[PDB]
């Protein structure tokens, strides 16, 4: 399928144990997609002081359209040293590995895969 319904656990930035997906734009997009498929991906909501506590390159989920079955359609955009790789809508948050942190909420997304 071109899209997959996922329910992403929303993590507090200070709980996150693995603060990014890797060392290059291509690697972090690759690893983010793998962890989304494997159910091992968390979401951190972006606010003042969040991104400097995570590791670049960043992987965002961004709204791709204006929401089937409650799932916002999203796609992945990476960021490294202020340059973004991809073009999309509003940020829903920054993706990180999930290694068993307790979430505060879930974000229902339809991921363009």
Sorted by where each starts, the structural domains of the chain and their CATH numbers stand as 3-112 (2.30.30)
Query: How was this structure obtained?
Result: X-ray
Cα radius of gyration rounded to whole Å, the chain: 13
Yes or no: say if 62 and 90 are a contact pair by the CB < 8 Å rule.
Answer: yes
Resolution in A, one decimal?
A: 1.5
User: CA geometry: angle at 95 spanning 89 and 100, to 5°?
Assistant: 150
Q: Determine the Cα–Cα distance for residues 110 and 64; give it in Å rounded to an integer.
A: 10
């Amino acid at each position: 399928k071109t899209h997959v319904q996922l329910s992403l656990p929303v993590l507090q930035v200070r709980d996150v144990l693995v603060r990014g997906f890797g060392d290059s734009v291509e690697e972090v997009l690759s690893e983010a997609r793998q962890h989304l498929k494997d159910g091992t991906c968390g979401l951190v909501e972006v606010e003042k002081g969040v991104l400097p506590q995570l590791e670049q390159p960043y992987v965002f989920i961004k709204r791709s359209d204006a929401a089937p079955h409650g799932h916002v359609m999203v796609e992945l955009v990476a960021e490294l040293e202020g340059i973004q790789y991809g073009r999309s809508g509003e940020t829903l948050g920054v993706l990180v590995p999930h290694v068993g942190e307790i979430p505060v909420a879930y974000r229902k997304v339809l991921l363009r895969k």
